[PDB]
Amino acid sequence: ENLYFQSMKAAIAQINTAALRHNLAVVKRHAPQCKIIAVVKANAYGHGLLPVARTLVDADAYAVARIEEALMLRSCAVVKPIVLLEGFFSAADLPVLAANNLQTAVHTWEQLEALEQADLPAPVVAWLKLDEMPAFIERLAKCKNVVQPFNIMTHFEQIDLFSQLTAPLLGECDWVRPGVILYGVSPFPNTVAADYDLQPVMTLKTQLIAVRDHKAGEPVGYGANWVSDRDTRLGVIAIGYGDGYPRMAPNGTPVLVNGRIVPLVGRVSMDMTTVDLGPGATDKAGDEAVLWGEGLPVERVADQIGTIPYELITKLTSRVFMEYV
Amino acid sequence: DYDIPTTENLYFQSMKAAIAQINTAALRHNLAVVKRHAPQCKIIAVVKANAYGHGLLPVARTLVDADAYAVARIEEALMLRSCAVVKPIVLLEGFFSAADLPVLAANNLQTAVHTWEQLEALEQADLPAPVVAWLKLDEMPAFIERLAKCKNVVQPFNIMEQIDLFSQLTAPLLGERAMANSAGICDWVRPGVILYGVSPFPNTVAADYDLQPVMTLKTQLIRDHKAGEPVGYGANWVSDRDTRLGVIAIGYGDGYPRMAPNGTPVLVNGRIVPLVGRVSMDMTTVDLGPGATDKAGDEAVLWGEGLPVERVADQIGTIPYELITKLTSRVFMEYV
């Protein structure tokens, strides 16, 4: 209400480029003689494909899930090699690879069959790994449309056969790449903290649209779900299920308002949701109110809801405004 | 007609991953059903959140017979006005900011007053030409007389356990109502979500009610033939019996919920097949069965024509309102 002009004050997901560059330096602090490879799939985990790619200029190579994202990177004058994770799931996706120089990843029999059947100038760089055990490694090696020797990208009791079979094969100290830790997400339930030199990039901010005072024993929340008669000054934030927030978990979801952690109450609507502050507290209309990120980690919020933090950052629809700092 | 593709979408007609087809023929059909029962009633759509994930601008051009429009925020109303829309735009939930009052008068919008903060800002602001305001939310305040005395409001207004008491108080007041709760268990009516082919309650689950869902969430079939043991990526694992499986290119990062691991219906080649295992970021597996062999790249519909969205929402647990609005920018909009 104390604003001056239109600057978009509703659902907003602020991205800190300073923390993004910091997380990449943390990987280089432990492994200096390693090939750093991002980790820019599903619109860079909901942080924006093109803006983070321009920021991570120190990254030796890029990695996407589909060709559509890889073509957007190459058009934005990137020269670093693009790795196609999960590979190609169409035979017509092979000539666009040899033309835009993309490094695919072969694992299924269908993409190996399509590689031998297709004829095209210049071969493509292939990566391999699984998800007893077929020895299609020699079939991939004898292929005419593949840069020989291929390349392997393993991981850090059920498999173990991949480790001994990769020993005679060459050969691209070390050259390891991250999971999601480049954004400040652990994400492991063993340690959901990730505060040890790790900063979250996405800070899901909103706005305090209205404040309601009960002043009487009324647990009613319009008529959908009830909570408690205890008199407390309630506040409503402008973020709903139609913005990307999950309708799951009632009393217990943490929300950071003016530094202090306040629990989310009742159900979630399409555009807004209510949160329990307190009668003694003084929260004015137009406050910060952050759902996940700085002050309250995304792994902590995901654990309270039940889902993994990977969904929380990718579930956000086109209604949320992308802020970059 | 379909607007020029905004920077940037794919040019593949055979599809790649995630597509939400919106049929305009059912959108026009549902509107005629409302007019069939109530002919002397002004129809008020019902385009609150990017037209419930169907696209604000394309459905507005289609619903030309609609007497008035209704949005949640000013941003959507300004997009309609710029697309040469002359019909009155109703601002649901009203304005939250005092600076949202001069734009309301300049673009001729119909705000909704319910909170005290809105009324305080209306009396405190001075602007040429008044705004048409709608009313509808000490206990039970009589601020109706205060709203009527306001200088920047088109007089009269225009109104839309707790209660019955509000329906009693609107009787002496003149003289334009609009509800909003139920059309069939008048002079002006506004539907809920029935204009898209979705029932607001799973009482009938759209079965024999007339009908036709607009959004048909299509995908593409991207093993073994065996059920196996590591089914998806991991964690949730089903049977091992020799049966034909299928994997569809739609994940949690597309808008699909990870909830209800097994039993969720998916329509593949007319036949209903249950969803198995968990849901990944870009894809999910579905159990086809031994009978009839299917090829990679089939239709595969999640909700809409052949399988209603209310039926899918009931199997997951959530309301159908979320399912159609949870879809992110990764899904491609087809009309065509």
The CATH number of the domain holding residue A180 is 3.20.20.10
Distance CA(B325)–CA(A244), nearest Å, equals: 8
**B319 is in which domain, residue-wise?**
1-23+199-336
Which candidate, A7, A12, A9, A6, places its Cα nearest to that of A243?
A12
Q: Do residues B42 and B121 both lie within one domain? A: yes
Q: Do residues A208 and A170 both lie within one domain? A: no
Rg (CA), chain A: 24
Whether residue B8 has a cis bond before it, omega within 30° of 0: yes
Boundary (domain end) residue, out of A143, A168, A185: A185
Q: Does B194 touch chain A (CB under 8 A)?
A: no
Residue A162's identity, in one-letter code, is F
Q: Do residues A34 and A92 both lie within one domain? A: yes
Boundary (domain end) residue, out of A146, A170, A185: A185
Q: How many C-beta neighbours within 10 Å does residue B85 have? A: 17
Q: Enter the tokens of residue A155.
A: 């991981």
Q: Do residues B137 and B262 both lie within one domain? A: no
Say if residues B192 and B319 touch (Cβ distance below 8 Å).
no
Q: Do residues B10 and B56 both lie within one domain? A: no
Residues listed for chain B: 336
Experimental determination approach used? X-ray
Distance CA(A215)–CA(B70), nearest Å, equals: 34
Distance CA(B244)–CA(B226), nearest Å, equals: 6
Say if residues B65 and B31 touch (Cβ distance below 8 Å).
yes
Distance CA(A53)–CA(A73), nearest Å, equals: 8
Q: Enter the tokens of residue A116.
A: 């031998």
β strands within chain A, DSSP E: 12-15, 37-39, 61-64, 82-84, 102-104, 202-205, 208-213, 233-237, 253-257, 260-268, 273-276, 321-324
Q: Do residues B40 and B176 both lie within one domain? A: yes
Q: Is A288 left (phi over 0), alpha (psi -120 to 50) or beta?
A: alpha
Q: Is A312 left (phi over 0), alpha (psi -120 to 50) or beta?
A: alpha
Torsion on CA atoms A259, A260, A265, A270, rounded to nearest 10: 0
CB contact under 8 A, B322 and A4: no
Say if residues B110 and B93 touch (Cβ distance below 8 Å).
no
Boundary (domain end) residue, out of A168, A185, A202: A185
Closest-CA residue of B relative to A209 is: B96
Q: Do residues A157 and A273 both lie within one domain? A: no
Q: Look up the CATH number of the domain holding residue A249.
A: 2.40.37.10
Task: Tell me the backbone φ, ψ of residue B93, rounded to 5 degrees.
Answer: 70, -5
In eight-state DSSP terms, residue A241 is T
Say if residues A80 and A61 touch (Cβ distance below 8 Å).
yes
Q: Do residues A251 and A160 both lie within one domain? A: no
Which candidate, B286, B312, B336, places its Cα nearest to that of B206?
B312
Helix (H) or strand (E) holding B271: strand B271-279
Q: Is the dihedral of CA B230, B233, B238, B243 positive or negative?
A: negative
Q: Do residues B285 and B138 both lie within one domain? A: no
Residue B329's identity, in one-letter code, is S
- Specify the number of domains making up chain B: 2
Chain A partners within 8 Å of B329 (Cβ):
43, 317-318
- The H-assigned helical ranges of A59-196 are 67-74, 95-100, 109-117, 137-141, 161-165
Whether B35 is catalytic: no
Give how far the C-alpha of residue B83 lies from the chain's centroid of Cα atoms, to the nearest Å.
21
The three-point CA angle A28-A44-B284 to 5° equals: 120
Distance CA(B17)–CA(A282), nearest Å, equals: 48
Distance CA(B336)–CA(B333), nearest Å, equals: 8
Q: Do residues B41 and B178 both lie within one domain? A: yes
Q: Does A309 touch chain B (CB under 8 A)?
A: no
Which candidate, B248, B250, B220, B265, places its Cα nearest to that of B326?
B250
Closest-CA residue of B relative to A267 is: B318
The three-point CA angle A245-A250-A252 to 5° equals: 100
Resolution attained, angstroms: 3.2
Residue B83's identity, in one-letter code, is C
Chain B partners within 8 Å of A270 (Cβ):
48-49, 321-322, 325
Q: Enter the tokens of residue A286.
A: 């137009």
Q: Do residues B1 and B47 both lie within one domain? A: no
Task: Tell me the backbone φ, ψ of residue B295, rounded to 5 degrees.
Answer: -95, 155
Q: Do residues A239 and A303 both lie within one domain? A: yes
Among A9, A28, A41, A315, the active-site one is: A41
Shortest distance between the Cα of A32 and any Cα of chain B, in A, equals: 31
Bridge partners (DSSP) listed for residue B265 = B274
Q: Tokens 């607001």 map to which residue?
A: B200
